[PDB]
Write an enzyme that holds these catalytic residues in place. Structure first.
Site, PDB file in Angstrom:
ATOM      1  N   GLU A  26       0.776  -1.234   0.000  1.00 35.17           N
ATOM      2  CA  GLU A  26       0.000   0.000   0.000  1.00 35.17           C
ATOM      3  C   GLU A  26       0.817   1.299   0.000  1.00 35.17           C
ATOM      4  OE1 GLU A  26      -2.687  -0.499   3.337  1.00 35.17           O
ATOM      5  OE2 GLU A  26      -3.422  -2.430   2.600  1.00 35.17           O
ATOM      6  N   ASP A  52     -12.053 -10.763  -1.386  1.00 37.02           N
ATOM      7  CA  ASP A  52     -13.285 -10.877  -0.610  1.00 37.02           C
ATOM      8  C   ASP A  52     -14.296  -9.918  -1.223  1.00 37.02           C
ATOM      9  OD1 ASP A  52     -12.614  -8.406   0.767  1.00 37.02           O
ATOM     10  OD2 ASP A  52     -11.738  -9.557   2.400  1.00 37.02           O
TER      11      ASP A  52
END
Ligand code: NA
Ligand code: NA
Ligand code: NA
Ligand code: NA
Ligand code: NA
Ligand code: NA
Length: 302
Positions: free
Chosen positions: A132, A240
């Site tokens: 990130e 997910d």
């Protein structure tokens, strides 16, 4: 454990794996979870045990009990392992984030990478070296690493990783790289092209793929756009989807399937109750650790 293994079916199409995550607790909380992992998935990412806060809580003092357990379980059961993660602004001890001298932070960074990678040298398929590091607009995140060392921390991290374990695939991982044209996707591609052209050893781009309902169909294009960065491979690393609809999950599976560079998918958890987004029931197994509709949809789409 589902009778049909989606990992086995995925591998049959030339992919490396369809995996999931674990750590001591979820691997021992009941009998169905570890059984599902061994029967239906072919890869594991430690959910938390390998992060900086869990591996080097104090300067130069390492704690490997939890990571040792995950690695040993995976290895003892023929599961590939994705190390996660080496450099990240989150789950980072205050002793690291308070460092203000460039050379001191570089020394710390190299020692962290070296010590963690050396311990599992040769047992790791891929390492999320950087995690990130991008702002949503495509610019570099002003983490302590960026603020103190500057952009050179990217080269330093990758070169060190490459030297310590040349057997591992070195990845840069990020979320919101979910549709072609998105600013973050564009920034990832442009920076990686530049870094690769500069000789920095980046083997792959990891796309977390934490999705909302209905966002699965945009993933194919995102992977296509990421393919232009020029890395040897790419992978869906933390999949997910809120609601876990069959359409969404099949769309994502097909996105990887139809892209040459995508070597595999890692679903971020096994059963809904253990999900970091449990209220959204975003996984393939339910509260009873039984296969959901999406799991079967995926099995029949392969
Ligand atoms: Na971890
Ligand atoms: Na640990
Ligand atoms: Na960073
Ligand atoms: Na390497
Ligand atoms: Na690429
Ligand atoms: Na993956």
């Amino acid at each position: 454990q589902a009778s049909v293994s989606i990992d086995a079916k995925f591998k049959a199409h030339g992919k490396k794996y369809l995996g999931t995550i674990g750590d001591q607790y979820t691997l021992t909380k009941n009998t169905k979870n570890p059984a599902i992992i061994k029967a239906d998935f072919g890869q594991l990412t430690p959910e938390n045990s390998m992060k900086w806060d869990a591996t080097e809580p104090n300067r130069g003092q390492f704690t490997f009990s939890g990571s040792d357990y995950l690695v040993n379980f995976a290895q003892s059961n023929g599961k590939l392992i994705r190390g996660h993660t080496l450099v990240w602004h989150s789950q980072l001890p205050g002793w690291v984030s308070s460092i203000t001298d460039k050379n001191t932070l570089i020394s710390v960074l190299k020692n962290h990478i070296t010590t963690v990678m050396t311990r599992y040298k040769g047992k790791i398929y891929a390492w999320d070296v950087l995690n990130e590091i991008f702002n949503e607009d495509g610019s570099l995140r002003n983490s302590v690493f960026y603020n103190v060392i500057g952009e050179d921390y990217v080269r330093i991290a990758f070169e060190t990783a490459r030297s310590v374990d040349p057997n591992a695939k070195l990845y840069i991982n990020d979320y919101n790289l979910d549709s072609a044209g998105y600013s973050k996707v564009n920034g990832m591609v442009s920076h990686v092209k530049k870094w690769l052209a500069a000789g920095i050893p980046i083997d792959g781009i990891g796309s977390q793929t934490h999705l909302g309902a209905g966002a699965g169909s945009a993933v194919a294009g995102a992977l296509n756009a990421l393919a232009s960065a020029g890395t040897k491979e790419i992978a869906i690393t933390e999949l997910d989807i809120a609601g876990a609809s069959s359409t969404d999950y099949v769309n994502v599976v097909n996105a990887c399937l139809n892209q040459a560079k995508c070597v595999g998918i890692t679903v971020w958890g096994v059963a809904d109750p253990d999900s970091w987004r449990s209220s959204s029931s975003p996984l393939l197994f339910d509260g009873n650790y039984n296969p959901k509709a999406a799991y079967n949809a995926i099995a029949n789409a392969l």
